[PDB]
Design a protein around this nucleic acid. Structure first.
Ligand SMILES: [Mg+2]
Ligand SMILES: [Mg+2]
Ligand SMILES: [Mg+2]
Ligand SMILES: [Mg+2]
Ligand SMILES: [Mg+2]
Ligand SMILES: [Mg+2]
Ligand SMILES: [Mg+2]
Lengths: 59, 50, 62, 538, 107, 71, 99, 26
RNA sequence: UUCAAAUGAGAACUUUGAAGACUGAAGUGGGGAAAGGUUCCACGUCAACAGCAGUUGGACGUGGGUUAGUCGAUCCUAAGA
């Protein structure tokens, strides 16, 4: 799962910025959940989504 | 020393986080040859020499 | 049972030395439950822990 | 040992429970079926108002005469696949919405708290007085309202697997009540069903319930039981707290395995006079199961990061259980005060809203609700430390799931019997063997359920009553009779359903069931079933 | 056989010539041996008040004579190898001199 | 850490090692919509930064803890 | 005293009925941890059978270092084969290297 | 082998209607 | 050094109490500087280590803990570099 770069490339700058803010909020919530649960596999896919959004913006 | 430098404290923090035995699930991997931490350090056995 | 921590906490709470604190030998389980200074204060209030008097140094002969 | 005072305490608790159940049925009908009310009540609001009504009614009875009284089982409202444990607090609505954002619409009724047409709404509640407990649970159906008709009525009956489950649960309840009443007059038991000199056994209970479930194409959910109730020991937390002596019949995945192949509960008991019995039955529909599979339960957690599954429910249980064998002095003053109130409650499961001084509210006011929530935030602060030191535990939220047998057979477990979940907090389900013959443990079975793509959820219908076997002396009319403390034709009146199945009369067990129904409908020379009446309100 | 007697022990001739740091501990061991001799019980238990009376004048100031009450009683525990034991108590008197062995009546 | 919420209206956070007290206060006020009375900080012996954030009397840290999710 | 003894009465409760002879009701942890306390050693091994297997593996691994009497994993003191101050003696009439 | 036999036994094994209520709100 | 109890499979050595002594304020007390770097504290806990022992530990396992406008560094110059 996660975002797809070819789907991201058809969006505008404001859409990508809003998506980045949403992803950062989700990562904060998952980091809160991790304090009780040390095995939380969705953290990896949210982190990689953040990296992909930043890559598309920079491109 | 109680009054220490940030560089010293950063190195001490790294040493503290490194101070541990193996995680148990490392033993269960396929073809695992790591059987103990051969670089474990103790405060009264080997000094860090800054 | 090991009551070393409770003995130290009782000395600190009462404000005297460890040599001046009496832990009731009959109430070992109750004292062993007390892991905080608040519980230690409760034990002091109800008498499971007692502050001993000072050893006398009289000056009558002096 | 029964006595007039014990019987009176049971009768009073049962009357309170019947009145509360009638109240919530009326509230549901006004919110969704009569539609006269401006604001539609949601599930947590229904639970809270129900608990307040129970406490206000209970305040008037047995004052300064009984040491302990209160709510035995907190008001639980379960929807479709959710088989129990759903008593959410009012301060978890926005949490539920935020947690389940980006999910499916399958648990929409429970996530939003607003009911939807076609939902199977199961209402469960219990009352204890002096440790003498009466529990009731009824499934009802949410229908769309007709428009053309002058009088508010459903457009049609409930149809399908939900109807099959409701009918199976209701008929099993009625037949079990009749069979247990036949223990008082053993000569009235039909000859084919069992011996004239033979008594009632858990074997007979199990085979009748299984016959009905098989006829209606349903499974028996592994939480079902027909057990004996004693003072302070009613199975109020059966999956959590252990018991020294158990007399009753249970259904498990192990029983499913044994049926397909052909402190420990056992069906080697005779139902004796002068005892109180709880009958709790959950029927799971197998309409969408095109194969033969196993009925199990999935537990709900509050972690959205544990998978990427769209049809997963994320929620936190609202009821806690106090473990009186565990002692630990807490570090927070809020925690210590909360523990004092929790120990004031008793050996029954409790809600955090039950512990507030404001609750129950005299006048339902916006400021009263606000003060309750203000208490609730600090209660959560204390509860985190109380549960972090194993002083209380959560009574789980469970969903009925179906796992096909071919996946279990093809799956390979290198550990067999030896595997067990060591990270589980509770010892009783953590060290569990659902399949003793196959050597499949609970953690292995959970792994198989999660790995299957054909592991679906099943709608569940519930019926649960409490009965007392009154002797010739204890009863009024010098003859033995079955006193139903809760449930019956006044409160647990069935909804409008229609099923394509029925019991096939060419079976001896089915003929015995029909004879039992005949003797129940006979009131002169048959069985005597005296139902407890709700008290009036307005 | 449950029984209780009062005896006088001459510690003077038992501690004759013992090193000063060892006198009171040797008195403890000598009283255990005395109780074993008089009651046949290898399990001897000394009262802490008796231990106080032994140690009352320090490590080298043990009294010449001591008046003891010795009780042979029954061991209630199932784990013990011996069904009988002796309990030694002190008898605080005006003087330990001139007293003979007596049998204490049990009530 | 959870004692400080009821003890002095204080939230305890792990914060970036590059962040100073101004940035901690600004980030807290932006993320959680509260007024901050003051910020004390330290560096833990594992090399991370801990921030004690005390809020004004107009705001309750108990509400913020409940909203964040640990309680 | 009779009044005090009559006042100090023992009345049982539901907790006495239910939890009086029981215990536990929670799985005892292997490292004495709280509910939300991390366990570095065991958090990666979910089931107890594999936990016991890995523990037995570690115990079998320990045997040679235990035979060499090491204070632990971290004790890696190395002795030289020969010490020059002990084996470089040719002592004239005068100052020696020790007393 | 008992596991083999149990598995093969399971493999071999798996290999008007009614109306309640009516048009009214209880 | 001694006595009883508790804990424990097991107690000369653990814990509490009962006692006997000692350091005797140039301390065997209460703090710091250099150095060390978690040794501090809690829970669990004994294979190896503690030249006897061990249920104890500065050991083994898992965590918690160090909050400054006013205390220091930071600023100044010294012999010097
Ligand atoms: Mg001589
Ligand atoms: Mg600072
Ligand atoms: Mg002296
Ligand atoms: Mg001297
Ligand atoms: Mg220490
Ligand atoms: Mg040794
Ligand atoms: Mg350590």
């Amino acid at each position: 799962a996660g975002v797809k770069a070819y789907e991201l490339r058809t969006k505008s700058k404001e859409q990508l910025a809003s998506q980045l803010v949403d992803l950062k909020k989700e990562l904060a919530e998952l980091k809160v959940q991790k304090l009780s649960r040390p095995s939380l596999p969705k953290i990896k896919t949210v982190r990689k989504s953040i990296a992909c959004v930043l890559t598309v913006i920079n491109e | 020393a109680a009054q220490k430098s940030f560089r010293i404290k950063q190195k001490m923090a790294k040493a503290k986080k490194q101070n541990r035995p193996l995680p148990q699930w490392i033993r269960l991997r396929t073809n695992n040859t790591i059987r103990y931490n051969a670089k474990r350090r103790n405060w009264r056995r080997t000094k860090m020499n800054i | 049972a090991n009551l070393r921590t409770q003995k130290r906490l009782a000395a600190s709470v009462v404000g005297v030395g460890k040599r001046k604190v009496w832990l009731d030998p009959n109430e070992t389980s109750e004292i062993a439950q007390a892991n905080s200074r608040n519980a230690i204060r409760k034990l002091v209030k109800n008498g499971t822990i007692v502050k001993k008097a000072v050893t006398v140094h009289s000056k009558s002969r002096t | 040992i029964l006595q007039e005072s014990v019987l009176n305490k049971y009768r009073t608790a049962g009357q309170i429970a019947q009145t509360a159940l009638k109240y919530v049925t009326s509230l549901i009908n006004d919110s969704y079926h009569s539609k006269t009310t401006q604001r539609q009540l949601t599930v947590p609001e229904l639970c809270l108002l129900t608990d307040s009504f129970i406490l206000t009614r209970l305040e008037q009875y047995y004052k300064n005469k009984v040491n302990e009284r209160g709510i035995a089982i907190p008001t639980t409202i379960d929807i479709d696949q959710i088989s129990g444990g759903w008593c959410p607090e009012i301060d978890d609505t926005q949490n539920l919405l935020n947690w389940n954002k980006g999910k499916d619409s399958t648990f929409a009724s429970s996530v939003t708290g607003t009911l939807r047409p076609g939902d199977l709404v199961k209402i469960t509640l219990g009352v204890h007085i002096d440790g003498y407990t009466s529990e009731v649970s009824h499934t009802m159906v949410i229908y769309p309202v007709d428009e053309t008709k002058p009088i508010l009525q459903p457009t049609g009956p409930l149809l399908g697997g939900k109807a099959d489950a409701v009918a199976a649960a209701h008929i099993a309840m009625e037949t079990v009540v009749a069979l247990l009443a036949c223990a008082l007059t053993p000569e009235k038991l039909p000859a084919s069903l069992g011996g004239t000199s033979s008594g009632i056994t858990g074997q007979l209970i199990r085979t009748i319930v299984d016959t009905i479930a098989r006829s209606y194409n349903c499974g028996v959910v592994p939480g079902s039981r027909v057990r004996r109730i004693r003072r302070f020991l009613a199975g109020q937390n059966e999956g959590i707290v252990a018991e020294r002596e158990y007399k009753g019949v249970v259904w498990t995945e192990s029983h499913q395995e044994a049926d397909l192949l052909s402190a420990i509960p056992s069906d080697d008991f005779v139902v004796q006079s002068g005892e109180v019995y709880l009958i709790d039955l959950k029927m799971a529909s197998l309409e969408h199961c095109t194969k033969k599979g196993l009925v199990t339960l999935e537990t709900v957690d509050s972690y959205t990061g544990k998978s990427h599954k769209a049809g997963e429910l994320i929620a936190r249980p609202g009821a806690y259980v106090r473990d009186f064998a565990q002692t630990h002095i807490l570090k927070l003053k809020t925690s210590r005060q909360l523990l004092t109130k929790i120990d004031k409650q008793g050996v029954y499961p409790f809600k955090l809203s039950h512990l507030s001084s404001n609750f129950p509210f005299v006048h339902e006011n916006e400021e009263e609700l606000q003060s309750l929530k203000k208490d609730l935030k600090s209660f959560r602060l204390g509860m985190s430390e109380i549960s972090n030191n194993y002083l209380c535990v959560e009574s789980p939220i469970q969903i009925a799931r179906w796992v096909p047998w071919d996946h279990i057979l093809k799956a390979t477990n290198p550990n067999g019997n030896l595997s067990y979940d060591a990270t589980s907090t509770l010892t009783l389900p953590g060290h569990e063997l659902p399949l003793p013959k196959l050597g499949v443990s609970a953690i292995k079975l959970k792994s198989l359920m999660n790995s299957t793509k054909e592991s679906i959820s099943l709608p569940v219908a519930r019926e649960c009553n409490t009965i007392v076997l009154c002797d010739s002396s204890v009863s009024t009319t010098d003859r033995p009779e079955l006193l139903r403390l809760t449930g019956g034709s006044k409160t647990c009146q069935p909804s409008w359903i229609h099923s394509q199945h029925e019991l096939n009369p060419q079976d001896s067990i089915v003929q015995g069931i029909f004879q039992l129904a005949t003797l129940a409908k006979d009131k002169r020379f048959g069985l005597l079933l005296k139902e407890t009446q709700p008290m009036k309100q307005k | 056989d449950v029984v209780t007697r009062e005896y006088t022990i001459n510690l003077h001739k038992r501690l004759h010539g013992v090193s000063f740091k060892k006198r009171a501990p040797r008195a403890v061991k000598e009283i255990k041996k005395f109780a074993k001799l008089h009651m046949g019980t290898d399990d001897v238990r000394l009262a802490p008040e008796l231990n106080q009376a032994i140690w009352k004048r320090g490590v080298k100031g043990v009294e010449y004579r001591l008046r003891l009450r010795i009780s042979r009683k029954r061991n209630e525990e199932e784990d013990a190898k011996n069904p009988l034991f002796s309990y030694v108590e002190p008898v605080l008197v005006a003087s330990a001199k001139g007293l003979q062995t007596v049998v204490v009546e049990e009530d | 850490a959870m004692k400080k919420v009821e003890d002095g209206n204080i939230l305890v956070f792990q914060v970036s090692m590059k962040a100073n007290k101004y940035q901690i206060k600004k980030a807290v006020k932006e993320l959680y919509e509260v007024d901050v009375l003051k910020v004390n900080t330290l560096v833990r012996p594992n090399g991370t930064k801990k921030a004690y954030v005390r809020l004004t009397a107009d705001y309750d840290a108990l509400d913020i803890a409940n909203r964040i999710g640990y309680i | 005293q009779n009044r005090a003894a009559r006042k100090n009465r023992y009345v049982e409760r539901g907790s006495d009925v239910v939890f009086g002879d029981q215990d536990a009701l929670t799985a005892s942890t292997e490292n004495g941890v709280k509910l939300r306390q991390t366990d570095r050693l065991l958090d990666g091994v979910a089931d107890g059978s594999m936990r016991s297997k890995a523990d037995r593996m570690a115990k079998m691994e320990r045997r040679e270092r235990n035979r060499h009497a090491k204070q632990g994993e971290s004790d890696r003191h190395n002795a030289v084969s020969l010490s020059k101050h002990l084996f470089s003696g040719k002592r004239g009439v005068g100052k020696t290297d020790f007393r | 082998s008992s596991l083999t036999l149990v598995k093969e036994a399971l493999w071999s094994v798996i290999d008007q209607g009614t109306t309640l209520g009516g048009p009214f709100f209880p």
